[PDB]
Amino acid sequence: TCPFYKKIPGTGFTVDAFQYGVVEGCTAYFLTHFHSDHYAGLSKHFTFPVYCSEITGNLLKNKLHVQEQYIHPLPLDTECIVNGVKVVLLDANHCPGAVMILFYLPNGTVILHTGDFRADPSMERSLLADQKVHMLYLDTTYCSPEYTFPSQQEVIRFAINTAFEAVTLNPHALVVCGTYSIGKEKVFLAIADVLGSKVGMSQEKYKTLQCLNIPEINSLITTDMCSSLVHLLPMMQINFKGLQSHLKKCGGKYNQILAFRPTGWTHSNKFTRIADVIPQTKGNISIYGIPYSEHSSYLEMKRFVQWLKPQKIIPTVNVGTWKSRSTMEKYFREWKLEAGY
Numbered sequence: 547t548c549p550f551y552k553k554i555p556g557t558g559f560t561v562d563a564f565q566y567g568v569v570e571g572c573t574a575y576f577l578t579h580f581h582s583d584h585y586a587g588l589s590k591h592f593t594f595p596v597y598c599s600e601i602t603g604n605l606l607k608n609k610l611h612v613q614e615q616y617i618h619p620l621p622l623d624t625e626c627i628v629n630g631v632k633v634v635l636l637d638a639n640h641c642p643g644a645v646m647i648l649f650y651l652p653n654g655t656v657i658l659h660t661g662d663f664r665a666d667p668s669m670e671r672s673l674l675a676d677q678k679v680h681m682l683y684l685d686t687t688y689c690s691p692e693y694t695f696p697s698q699q700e701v702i703r704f705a706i707n708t709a710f711e712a713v714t715l716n717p718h719a720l721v722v723c724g725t726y727s728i729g730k731e732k733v734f735l736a737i738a739d740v741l742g743s744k745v746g747m748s749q750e751k752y753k754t755l756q757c758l759n760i761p762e763i764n765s766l767i768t769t770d771m772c773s774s775l776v777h778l779l780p781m782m783q784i785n786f787k788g789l790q791s792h793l794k795k796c797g798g799k800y801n802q803i804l805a806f807r808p809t810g811w812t813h814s815n816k817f818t819r820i821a822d823v824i825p826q827t828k829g830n831i832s833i834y835g836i837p838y839s840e841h842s843s844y845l846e847m848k849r850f851v852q853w854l855k856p857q858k859i860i861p862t863v864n865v866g867t868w869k870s871r872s873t874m875e876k877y878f879r880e881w882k883l884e885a886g887y
């Protein structure tokens with residue numbers, strides 16, 4: 547049974563609600579982004595209208611085989627009418643194709659559903675600038691002040707400089723980057739660009755990347771592993787055993803691996819600056835955990851909400867425990883008292 551925070555009152559609509567069977571009253575199912583917790587339940591046998599971005603719709607058709615007649619892609623930053631209700635899709639600054647959805651209810655209420663997002667000050671000059679929002683369905687993944695991490699630009703600077711130094715010292719080093727979903731493609735594309743290489747990967751991952759509308763992608767990636775000195779591997783293989791095994795397969799071309807695991811936040815963020823990050827090393831293998839986030843930090847979240855001034859907030863993450871729910875409610879009240887709305 548579909549939970550309340552996935553339903554949009556006053557409409558036939560649900561958001562990211564595909565794992566509940568046929569939802570009673572739903573005439574259109576919105577999908578914010580192609581992450582498995584959110585698409586869970588979609589397959590080629592699905593027969594209701596799915597509304598999403600162009601990029602999400604590429605992935606639904608090619609990766610999950612949803613039939614074309616049920617895929618309804620909408621352009622961003624554009625007022626569209628869906629089953630009699632005005633909607634807008636906005637870039638969520640999460641993974642490729644991720645959106646926030648603005649719903650203009652027939653009674654005059656305005657609802658923003660953030661999906662998954664990384665709040666940015668640029669959002670204060672989107673179509674959100676122009677009107678009041680009554681209800682906010684909020685990505686509260688990191689809603690506590692302990693969750694700090696650097697900008698994506700500082701993290702990429704660290705990675706580029708680390709990879710370039712290592713491979714210039716040793717032209718026989720291979721770089722490996724872990725992946726298990728879409729998102730975070732800047733990590734491996736920025737490192738391959740500094741090294742003058744394409745990125746090598748499996749046929750399955752190449753297929754996924756071909757759906758993403760990234761400019762000049764045919765110039766940046768390949769399935770020919772032998773021609774590439776940056777390889778992508780499943781995240782589960784980013785450990786000393788998995789990397790040892792991979793280096794064997796390279797036929798004595800390489801004699802060292804430098805590997806990256808982009809994580810979200812980890813408790814080593816509470817003590818260490820990005821500049822001071824060091825790897826775990828065993829012999830000729832080193833592994834860096836880098837804090838590349840596609841969700842808001844606490845301070846980015848707080849700034850966005852204090853700017854938007856919603857009348858009510860509905861969290862969409864961390865909703866299963868009373869302790870989480872109590873914590874989040876306290877922060878929302880502080881923010882409102884401090885700002886005056």
Ligand code: NI
Pocket residue numbers: 579581640662
């Ligand atoms: Ni996500």
